[PDB]
């Protein structure tokens, strides 16, 4: 064990156990919402199964627009329903 040691290769013992970004789309379609930094195994144990989660809740301001007719502030995903 030595930080200064030249690395020869990967341990052969370890080795035993082993391109478009767009090609990810079909696995993503089958994959539920994922968080950068909230571990699912741990949200299963420590949090209520039906818990809401907003990761980095303050890292951007709330994305909304305001209805010109009635002044209501609408979440992006509420806008199309509110109009149509």
């Amino acid at each position: 064990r030595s930080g200064d040691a030249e690395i020869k290769g990967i341990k052969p013992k370890v080795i035993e156990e082993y391109d478009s970004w767009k090609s990810l789309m079909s696995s993503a379609k089958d994959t539920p919402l994922q968080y950068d930094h909230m571990n699912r195994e741990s949200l299963k144990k420590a949090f209520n199964p039906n818990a809401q989660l907003i990761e980095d809740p303050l890292d951007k301001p709330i994305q909304y627009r305001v209805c010109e007719k009635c002044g209501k502030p609408l979440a992006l995903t509420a806008i199309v329903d509110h109009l149509e």
Binding site: D19, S20, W21, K22, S23, L24, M25, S27, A28, K29, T31, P32, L33, Q34, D36, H37, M38, N39, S42, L43, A46, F47, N48, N50, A51, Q52, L53, I54, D56, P57, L58, D59, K60, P61, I62, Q63, Y64, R65, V66, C67, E68, K69, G71, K72, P73, L74, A75, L76, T77, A78, I79, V80, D81, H82, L83, E84
Partner: protein, 438 residues
């Protein structure tokens, strides 16, 4: 303030535009719906150097390449192949490699999920006005109502409650549909005024619902329970009402603020652990007497105490040894609400307010306060303090809005204030929102 002229050039062609938006929507979709390993190896591996996280990694708009920043490999690609736009795979923001800057000021790109409906959207809805964009506004007292308004401020700057309200969830399901009859509705009106253009009409309409039924904590429990009623009342049948009352409610309150405690009572003599219980909470009341740090109060809350209970005989073994009781968190909420118990009521009939300054962190770790552990970190976003005596006093809220800037709400007065000043508050309620879970 200019706007990348290169993406403007692409938007002239109507077909090339829709390719850009379809792609932005796809990348962002993939980024929200890939498992860590997948993400690392397929959105943060560099096409050229094959390093993971060589700084930011950009997913090309026009092809499948991904290129790192620290070695200018996306820049190279943009120069070599002429593909000058990439999405940052940590955040889905779009970079122009000729401007050497992010394109953040184009609403259509920001709101790309609405691309198919854009001409409708952008003519029939406006961006929020400068004054209302962070919901900042005093709420006048008008009759010993700072315990109401200060609670309300933390609520209407709560990311979960804002999202819920602006999502129109309640509006589209409410049966009572009346600000003067229904609480959730009244709160909806306040969000309307503070974030849109309709600024006490909502808060006015909130005392009128209170006409139909001093401590800010009691009002917190009061108001969230009302919100929960309103949800129960909108439910389509008796069966769902039973569930939401007796089993698992799925309303905003019960999926944001509710945790549960394990209350373990064990008898030394024979380890009988039978008065052990799992009890819901919507906040935690901590003792602060002769304490100086929130973590000490949590240690207190969590430590084994002896139950002084005359003249107890272990149901199971007859031992007169005090039962050992310990509290631990069995399930944590997304927003943890802490009450420091400052208003000590006395057997002699009087009251005390404890003024002890309790130090509290901007990031709180609850890992040691659970029960059978990895880091479980919350971010302070709200504080309510009490000024004055038990008799005549007021309440003041403090909220951390987006960006990291803190404000102070003193009835009509709203005022900027530093994080360093907020931390020196004599805190009463503390609102912490879940931030990281290892």
């Amino acid at each position: 303030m200019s706007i990348c002229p290169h993406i403007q050039q692409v938007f002239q062609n109507e077909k090339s535009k829709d390719g850009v938006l379809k792609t932005c929507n796809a990348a962002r979709y993939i980024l929200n719906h890939s498992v860590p390993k997948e993400k690392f190896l397929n959105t943060m591996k560099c096409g050229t150097c094959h390093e993971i996280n060589s700084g930011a990694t950009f997913m090309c708009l026009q092809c499948g390449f991904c290129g790192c920043w620290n070695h200018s490999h996306f820049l190279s690609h943009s120069k070599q192949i002429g593909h000058i736009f990439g999405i940052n795979s940590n955040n889905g923001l779009l970079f122009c490699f000729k401007c050497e800057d992010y394109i953040g000021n184009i609403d259509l790109i920001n709101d790309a999920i609405l691309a198919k409906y854009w001409d409708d959207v952008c003519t029939k809805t406006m961006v929020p006005s400068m004054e209302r964009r962070d919901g900042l506004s005093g709420l006048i007292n008008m009759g010993s109502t700072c315990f109401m308004s200060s609670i309300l401020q933390c609520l209407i700057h709560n990311p979960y409650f804002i999202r819920h309200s602006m999502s129109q969830i309640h509006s589209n399901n409410c049966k009572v549909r009346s600000p003067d009859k229904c609480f959730s509705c009244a709160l909806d009106k306040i969000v309307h005024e503070l974030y849109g253009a309709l600024r006490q009409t909502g808060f006015i309409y909130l005392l009128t619902c209170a006409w139909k039924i001093q401590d800010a904590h009691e009002f917190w429990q009061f108001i969230i329970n009302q919100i929960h009623q309103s949800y129960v009342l909108d439910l389509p049948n008796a069966k769902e009402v039973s569930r939401a009352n007796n089993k698992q409610c799925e309303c905003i309150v019960h999926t944001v603020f509710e945790g549960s405690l394990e209350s373990s009572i064990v008898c030394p003599g024979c380890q009988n652990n039978s008065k052990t219980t799992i009890d819901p909470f919507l906040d935690l009341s901590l003792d602060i007497k002769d304490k100086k740090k929130l973590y000490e109060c949590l240690d207190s809350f969590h430590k084994k105490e002896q139950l002084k209970d005359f003249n107890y005989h272990c149901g199971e073994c007859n031992s007169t040894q005090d039962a050992i009781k310990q509290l631990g968190i069995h399930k944590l909420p997304s927003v943890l609400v802490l009450q420091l118990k400052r208003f000590e009521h006395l057997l002699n009939g009087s009251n005390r307010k404890l003024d002890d300054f309790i130090e509290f962190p901007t990031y709180l770790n609850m890992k040691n306060y659970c029960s059978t552990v990895p880091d479980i970190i919350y971010e302070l976003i709200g504080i309510v303090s009490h000024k004055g005596t038990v008799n005549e006093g007021h309440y003041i809220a403090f909220c951390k809005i987006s960006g990291g800037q803190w404000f102070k709400f003193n009835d009509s007065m709203v005022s900027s204030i530093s994080q360093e000043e907020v931390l020196k508050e004599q805190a009463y309620l503390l609102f912490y929102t879940i931030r990281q879970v290892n």
